[PDB]
């Protein structure tokens, strides 16, 4: 409640103001070298929260109407040659120019890609 | 403060660009380059103000972004490129090779030259040092490093540079009986055949000079620049030949020269 | 921070100057670190123009020169007390330039034995040729030859470890060595 996110390592679960830099969560620097003091909730769970966030590690017996019923795909495929190579298991010399994936787009009745 | 100035106001710009001051606003600040801020002439000034080929900075930029104009065989599409003394400017329009030289009043004379003369330029050696791996080098007034020169090229001599290969064809020593083109000072633009030299260890070596009219004068050796022997210059000299006809002679000319 | 400036001091007449400028990074001074012995720990500080300085904390090795013979060898270094310098900025029993230290002596012992064929204290054709050629030089000094018995050599640090990050130095020899140990009464 009040919208402040939780941060790992930040026991004493209260909104504490805390300096933040780059390459660390809950702050986006606007300038190079800009640091800023921001209220951040601790890592320990309690009643004062509003939203938890959970990641399913193991799947139970049932299946769910949003989560497990569906399967949303990965939008982008690999743009680098060796990554495509690992993706398709070709591994030496195998001309990635054709193995890379396409995406047809319907610009209208006549469609390029 | 807090870092270097990027601007330059009208009234602060050297007087030998000739523009206008009182809240006329800004002037073109020469970018960093081979020559100093004050002892230089940017191309915007050379083209808008002297030759009148252009009327505006955007016109000058339109010129420069077409590889038309080149300084020392190189294009230099920068607007505020500091061109300086003895620099060759080449326009394929009219095939006009412009040498930047000094008139006697201290402005930048717009000398037109032949292609054979534009092939080269001259350079006053400022220092002679050994670089890394025992390689001797000379530094000229235009920030040109030249490796492995003749070992007789000592300091304040001048050097002939071929401008396509940055190499040395011939050098001229600093001695009595040598022509000089004064660069910098009150006596800027005068040409006068060194009489002698005055040493003053730790104290700004002075030089005594004598024009063709036997008008002796004195300058500072940092401001002296040799160009040749008695009566055999290595450059086409401008209209005036560095004599400084006094104001009286000048009015006598432009009254008796011409009723126009 | 630490202003390395003179506008704050006083005039030579004794005049109290006015605080005239907010402190400037031109006039910048920084905090030392107490270069101790053991467990190499070097932190890089960014300086003017980039130009990393290597602030050493707790070096263990150093590079020491034996100039009468004209060599340099890496050794481990030993005890210290310094300085007679500071109270504010550096603190604890440090290691610094101009400090006298004891060093390992074993690489110099090995080098001397292999280069002259002669011990200190107490074969093949090429080696014998070389030793006989460059003999009549293994005669250094009573003091150094006596130090080699203990196996610990008096040396002076010539590097500035808080600037460069090293403990380079030179072995004491001659009038220096005759001079030195009447001194080194210091902490901080």
């Amino acid at each position: 409640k009040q919208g402040f996110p939780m941060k790992q390592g930040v026991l004493l679960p209260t909104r504490i103001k805390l300096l933040l830099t780059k390459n660390v969560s809950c702050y986006r620097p606007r300038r190079d070298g800009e640091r800023k003091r921001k209220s951040v909730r601790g890592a320990i769970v309690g009643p004062d929260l509003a939203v938890l966030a959970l990641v399913i590690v193991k799947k139970g017996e049932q299946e769910l109407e949003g989560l497990t019923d569906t399967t949303v795909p990965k939008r982008l495929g690999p743009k680098r040659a060796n990554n495509i190579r690992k993706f398709f298991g070709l591994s030496k010399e195998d001309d990635v120019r054709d193995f890379v994936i396409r995406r047809e787009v319907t610009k209208g009745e006549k469609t390029y890609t | 403060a807090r870092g270097p100035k990027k601007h330059l106001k009208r009234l602060a710009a050297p007087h030998h660009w000739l523009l206008d001051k009182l809240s006329g606003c800004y002037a073109p600040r020469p970018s960093a380059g081979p020559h100093k801020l004050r002892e230089s002439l940017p191309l915007i000034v050379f083209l808008r103000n002297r030759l009148k080929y252009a009327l505006n900075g955007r016109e000058v930029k339109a010129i420069l972004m077409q590889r038309h104009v080149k300084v020392d065989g190189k294009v230099r599409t920068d607007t505020t490129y500091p061109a300086g003394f003895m620099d060759v400017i080449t326009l394929d329009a009219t095939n006009e090779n412009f040498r930047l030289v000094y008139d006697v009043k201290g402005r930048f004379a717009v000398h037109r030259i032949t292609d054979e003369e534009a092939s080269y330029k001259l350079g006053k050696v400022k220092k002679v040092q050994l670089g890394k791996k025992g390689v001797p080098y000379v530094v000229t007034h235009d920030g040109r490093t030249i490796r492995y020169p003749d070992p007789n090229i000592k300091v304040n001599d001048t050097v002939k540079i071929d401008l396509a290969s940055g190499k040395i064809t011939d050098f001229i020593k600093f001695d009595a009986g040598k022509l000089v083109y004064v660069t910098g000072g009150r006596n800027l633009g005068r040409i006068g055949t060194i009489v002698h030299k005055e040493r003053h260890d730790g104290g700004f070596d002075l030089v005594h000079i004598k024009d063709s009219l036997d008008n002796t004068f004195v300058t500072r050796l940092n401001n002296v620049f040799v160009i040749g022997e008695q009566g055999k210059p290595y450059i086409s000299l401008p209209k005036g030949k560095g004599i400084k006809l006094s104001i009286a002679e000048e009015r006598d000319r432009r009254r008796a020269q011409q009723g126009l | 921070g630490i202003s390395r400036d003179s506008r704050h001091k006083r005039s030579a007449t004794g005049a109290k100057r006015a605080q005239f400028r907010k402190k400037r990074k031109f006039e910048l001074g920084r905090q030392p670190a107490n270069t101790k012995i053991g467990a190499k720990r070097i932190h890089s500080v960014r300086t003017r123009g980039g130009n990393k300085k290597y602030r050493a904390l707790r070096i263990e090795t150093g590079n020491f020169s034996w100039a009468s013979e004209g060599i340099s060898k890496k050794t481990r270094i030993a005890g210290v007390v310094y300085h007679p310098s500071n109270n504010e900025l550096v603190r604890t029993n440090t290691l610094t330039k101009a400090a006298i230290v004891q060093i390992d002596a074993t690489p110099f012992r090995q080098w001397f034995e292999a280069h002259y064929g002669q011990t200190l204290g107490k074969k093949s054709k090429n080696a014998e040729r070389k030793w006989a050629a460059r003999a009549a030089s293994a005669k250094i000094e009573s003091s150094v030859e006596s130090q080699f018995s203990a196996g610990r050599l008096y040396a002076c640090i010539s590097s500035r470890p808080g600037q460069s990050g090293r403990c380079d130095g030179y072995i004491l020899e001659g009038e220096e060595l005759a001079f030195y140990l009447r001194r080194l009464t210091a902490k901080k």
């Binding site: - | 260890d201 730790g202 | 009468s68 007679p84 030089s137 250094i140 001659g174 001079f179 001194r183």
Partner: protein
């Protein structure tokens, strides 16, 4: 003079990177560095023959004389290796078309190559900063006495 004997201090005083090898039995036992300071200033025999170190000396030390050369009268010799000279001059006031006497006192480093006394005229040269107040070094002396010691002997 200066009775450092040579090594009065708790550190060893030496010229840096001037190495006298105890191995080579050179028949001098006296390796020093000196330089010609330049500008026709004579390097004294006291500096060449002496034993002092004085890193702030313009002959045996590391400083260099560059810039101005001044003259003055020694009005103090009570510090160690530095003096204060008086530099007197006349300042023009145009309103009155006349002058007024002015002095500036100028602290100077003096090597122990020079025996300097209050009253002596002394020529000094600009060095880098070597103290809070000192920027000049003695490079020549002119004693205004003629060694007039026996004039005090009267009987």
């Amino acid at each position: 003079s200066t009775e450092l004997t040579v090594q009065s201090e708790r550190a060893f005083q030496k010229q840096p990177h001037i190495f006298n090898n105890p191995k080579v039995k050179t028949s001098k036992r006296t390796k020093r560095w000196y330089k010609n300071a330049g500008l026709g200033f004579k390097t004294p025999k006291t500096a060449i023959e002496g034993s002092y170190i004085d890193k702030k000396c313009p002959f045996t030390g590391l400083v260099s004389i560059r810039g101005k050369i001044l003259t003055g009268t020694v009005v103090s010799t009570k510090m160690h290796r530095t003096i204060v000279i008086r530099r007197a001059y006349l300042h023009y006031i145009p309103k009155y078309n006349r002058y007024e006497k002015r002095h500036k006192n100028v602290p100077v480093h003096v090597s122990p190559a020079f025996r300097v006394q209050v009253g002596d005229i002394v020529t000094v040269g600009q060095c880098r900063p070597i103290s809070k107040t000192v920027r000049f070094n003695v490079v020549k002396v002119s004693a205004a006495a003629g060694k007039a010691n026996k004039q005090f002997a009267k009987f």
